[PDB]
Amino acid sequence: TRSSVLADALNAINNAEKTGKRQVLIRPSSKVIIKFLQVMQKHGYIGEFEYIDDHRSGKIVVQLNGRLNKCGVISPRFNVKIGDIEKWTANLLPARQFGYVILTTSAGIMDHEEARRKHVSGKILGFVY
Amino acid sequence: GWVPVTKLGRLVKAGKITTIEEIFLHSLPVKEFQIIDTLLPGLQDEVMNIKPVQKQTRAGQRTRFKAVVVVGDSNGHVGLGIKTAKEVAGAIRAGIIIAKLSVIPIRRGYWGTNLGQPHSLATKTTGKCGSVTVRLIPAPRGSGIVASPAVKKLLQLAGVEDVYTQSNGKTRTLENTLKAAFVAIGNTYGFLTPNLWAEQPLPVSPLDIYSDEASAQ
Amino acid sequence: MENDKGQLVELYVPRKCSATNRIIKADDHASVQINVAKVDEEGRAIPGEYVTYALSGYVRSRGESDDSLNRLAQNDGLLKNVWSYSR
Amino acid sequence: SLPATFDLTPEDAQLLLAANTHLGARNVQVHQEPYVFNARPDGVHVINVGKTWEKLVLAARIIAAIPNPEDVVAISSRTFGQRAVLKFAAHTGATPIAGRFTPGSFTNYITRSFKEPRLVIVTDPRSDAQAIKEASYVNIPVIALTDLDSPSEFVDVAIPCNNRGKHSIGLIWYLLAREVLRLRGALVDRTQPWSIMPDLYFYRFP
Amino acid sequence: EKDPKRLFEGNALIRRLVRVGVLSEDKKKLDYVLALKVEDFLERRLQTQVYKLGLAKSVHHA
Amino acid sequence: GRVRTKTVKRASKALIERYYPKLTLDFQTNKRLCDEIATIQSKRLRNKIAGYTTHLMKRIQKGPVRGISFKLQEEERERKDQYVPEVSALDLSRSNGVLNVDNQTSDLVKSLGLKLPLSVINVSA
RNA sequence: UAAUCUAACCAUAAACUAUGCCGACUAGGGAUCGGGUGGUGUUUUUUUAAUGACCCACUCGGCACCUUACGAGAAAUCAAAGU
Known part of the structure; x- marks a missing residue:
């Protein structure tokens, strides 16, 4: 039964952008859904979104541009050290100059360039390109 | 000689198109192999495999010859075609023409x-x-x-x-x-x-800028 | 794409679609591109001016083409009251 | 961006409701549901005529935006249309096609019937799809006369009609043929009615 | 870049290839060694540098 | 026991397409004609070729062709009154100057808000 | 939310097999079986309101069936054998 909420909150997106739609409807929301979304929004991959609430756990309605190829989740959230980001990043990402893998790290959820110049590390969460 | 019989072909015979990229921008269909030759004169082929193949018509074992030919530049354009034929030297020259017809770029x-x-x-x-x-x-x-x-x-x-x-x-x-x-x-x-990611406006085709030309009689 | 010095070094930049922002390659042989005619104050047509729409290969095959025309055209004032957002 | 002379004339719609062209078929498909005003208690659905005219001036704004007026092709294979295409293409200049379409006539340039148009106008794309399907290979936009049982694949700007009556198939060619000339400058004033009788475009057999 | 192992082990590898004369003196950048070829060492042997400098009439007289 | 081969059949309709005003429903005249406008090797082949063109040519005086025919270009352009009626079938004068419509379709014209002389009737089912 | 409910027979049915099974999402089409909400529509008649049957439209749940295919596959084929 329903085990991960984020894992099918990103399966609902690219399943309805392979068919070229413009908006999707997510259910339920989460504190870690929104911050995964807020890092695909300061880089341009999605548009804007709204949070319903209905007193249980809200839904979300997202607006998609044209620019996502794939966004995903990595399901045992393993434990990335600090010398081992660049082996995760040479395998998941299509080329060396774009795309991002994001991490839950002791100073917030962030992408993998942003974690380099703050000099932190944590557990993996997903990717986006 | 060369008579163009397709209305792209008259536009390039008269020399209104100077590079192949105008075929690629508006993605135009091409059906005459002489168009590529004037457009890309440096094109150059090799033959990969030639294999005899067999059909048991009338229990008479007639021989065909399948050929795999790749043509290509050394800048960014390739092509590839396959043709079976009754005689060996016809299958090579027929195999080149389909390969000249299917040229694509590469980023x-x-x-x-x-x-x-x-x-x-x-x-x-x-x-x-x-x-x-x-x-x-x-x-x-x-x-x-x-x-x-x-x-x-x-x-x-x-x-x-x-x-x-x-x-x-x-x-x-x-x-x-x-x-x-x-x-x-x-x-x-x-x-x-x-x-x-950036935005550009749409250009307009050569197939109606020069519309009076390349029109049949 | 451009080098250290600055010049563009592709072959040539390709055409984005206009309904779904995809990219239309050199073998998308159902990729329609459509012009309409501007109008004159007397009610005639200028012979040289256009408004251009580019539609991909696969918004047509599913059948979602004409609605994507009415959505696209009505933003440019060509029509009025034939398409509606809140369906 | 089209002035009040382009609005719907109350005299014009008097023809259409007289011509019984506002009666769709009894089974809508899922793509043409914007075009339905309301259902009748009998079982039929009423097309929105103010929509079918608003997407009528658009096609003429495409037909008038072509350089050579012989690059339009207009096709029918039903009996009810294949007079109306001829008098359309008569005094406009399109290359008409009536009766049978021969297969492989937009590809295969070794045929004698080979053509390379700029538009295609079909009437009934259910029983006509050979011209639809072949135009998909060679970048040819298309315009149809759609009913509510019409497979609207590959089809751009789509005039909603009634493809069952005999007046209603003919009349939409006539109003299209009236409008395309006004845009060219070949006429004089929008407000004057057309001198030709619209019954010319019909079909009759003894 | 600006990583102190790149700067100490880089500027020594570059410095050794010029000191024998394989890298060109204008190609002192680290990406330029990745397109070095095999005869750019073959043209520095004594068998080759004595024939070019005019002492033997052929490469087998070296 | 006698049907005509395609080389009779094909060339008989090529000759009818290039010299149609010159031809004639009598066989004995245009027997003397095909030697002028074409090259026939034998003599019996000429007699067969001109035999079926005249049999083809009297179809033209009853129906249309499977080649091209400028009666389409002119006499079917005389068919622009196949029957043009002097008063139209789409005339409201046949309906006493008032349009007879269903009930709720009158709300369609009231939706776009126009002033038409229409009447309304009752509907069953 | 996880210890493993006459008889016996001989194989004499190409004897169709890499389906915790639960969960989310992704195109159409009409027939039928249960439960519910609607309706100026019918008609047994109490009356063309209603009980009453019908009829129409929606709706949640069922075993099946016909289309196509963006997709998947070595192919036959498959609304999952797809993502």
Whole structure:
């Protein structure tokens, strides 16, 4: 039964952008859904979104541009050290100059360039390109 | 001589189109092999495999000859066709013409930093046909091409200097292998990278700027 | 794509679609491109001016083409009251 | 961006409701549901005529935006249309096609019937799809006369009609043929009615 | 870049290739060694540098 | 026991397409004609070729052709009154100057808000 | 939310097999079986309101069936054998 909420909150997106739609409807929301979304929004991959609430756990309605190829989740959230980001990043990402893998790290959820110049590390969460 | 009988052909016979990219921007269909020859005079072929093949008509075993011919530049344009025929030297020359007809570009990018020309692929790509998969991967300088010899010879004529391959599936029917490396190139223009994010306005076709010309009588 | 010095080094930049922002390659042989005619104050047509729409290969095959025309055209004032957002 | 002379004339719609062209078929498909005003208690659905005219001036704004007026092709294979296409293409200049379409006539340039148009106008794309399907290979936009049982694949700007009556198939060619000339400058004033009788475009057999 | 192992082990590898004369003096950048070739060492042997400098009439007289 | 081969059949309709005003429903005249406008090797082949063109040519005086025919270009352009009626079938004068419509379709015209002389009737089912 | 409910027979049915099974999402089409909400529509008649049957439209749940295929597959084929 329903085990991960984020894992099918990103399966609902690219399943309805392979068919070229413009908006999707997510259910339920989460504190870690929104911050995964807020890092695909300061880089341009999605548009804007709204949070319903209905007193249980809200839904979300997202607006998609044209620019996502794939966004995903990595399901045992393993434990990335600090010398081992660049082996995760040479395998998941299509080329060396774009795309991002994001991490839950002791100073917030962030992408993998942003974690380099703050000099932190944590557990993996997903990717986006 | 050459009579153009298709209305693209009159436009290029009169010399209203100087590069092949106007065929590619508005994605125009091409059906006369003389158009490419004046457009790309440096084109150049090799033959990959020639195999006799057999059909038991009337229990009379008539021989055909299948040929696999790749044509290609050494800048970014390739082509590939296959033709069976009754005689050997007809199957080669008929095999060239379909390969001249199917020419596609290739986006050639970098590995890492930005010094000088592009050598390797832009991203990673993959095409599958039949049961074979073939996947192409960017490489640093000095790498060269690591592939099988039948696939290394293809990528010379598209002019990629360094690339990394990895192929799955039954790779020992070469008509199907080359038809997978072909798909895995031609997708390179089609992956929307972030520098292609900006907006441009639509241009207008040559097939109605010069509309009075290239019209039948 | 451009080098250290600055010049563009592609072959040539390709055409984005206009309904779904995809990219239209050199073998998308159902990729329609359509012009309409501007109008004059007397009610005639200028012979040289256009408004241009580019539609991909696959918004047509599913059948979602004409609605994507009415959505696109009505933003440019060509029509009025034939398409509606809140369906 | 089209002035009040382009609005719907109350005299014009008096023809259409007289011509019984506002009665769709009894089974809508899922793509043409914007075009339905309301259902009748009998079982039929009423097309929105103010929509079917608003997407009528658009086609003429495409037909008038072509350089050579012989690059339009207009096709029918039903009996009810194949007079109306001829008098359309008569005094406009399109290359008409009536009766049978021969297969492989937009590809295969070794045929004698080979053509390379700029538009295609079809009537009934259910029983006509050979011209639809072949135009998909060679970048040819298309315009249809759609009913509510019409497979609207590959089809751009789509005039909603009634493809069952005999007046209603003919009349939409006539109003299209009236409008395309006004845009060219070949007429004089929008407000004057057309001198030709619209019954000319019909079909009759003894 | 600006990583102190790149700067100490880089500027020594560059410095050794010029000191024998394989890298060109204008190609002192680290990406330029990745396109070095195999005869750029073959042209520095004594068998080759004595024939070019005019002492033997052929490469087998060296 | 006698049907005509395609090389009679094909060339008989090529000759009818290039010299149609010159031809004639009598066989004995245009027997003397095909030697002028074409090259026939034998003599019996000429007699067969001109035999079926005249049999083809009297079809033209009853119906249309499977070649091209400028009666389409002119006499079917005389068919622009196949029957043009002097008063139209789409005339409201046949309906006493008032349009007879269903109930709720009158709300369609009231939706776009126009002033038409229409009447309304009752509907069953 | 996880210890493993006459008889016996001989195989004499190409004897169709890499389906915790639960969960999310992704195109159409009409028939039928249960439960519910609607309706100026019918008609047994109490009356063309209603009980009453019908009829129409929606709705949640069922075993099946016909289309196509963007997709998947070595192919036959498959609304999952897809993502």
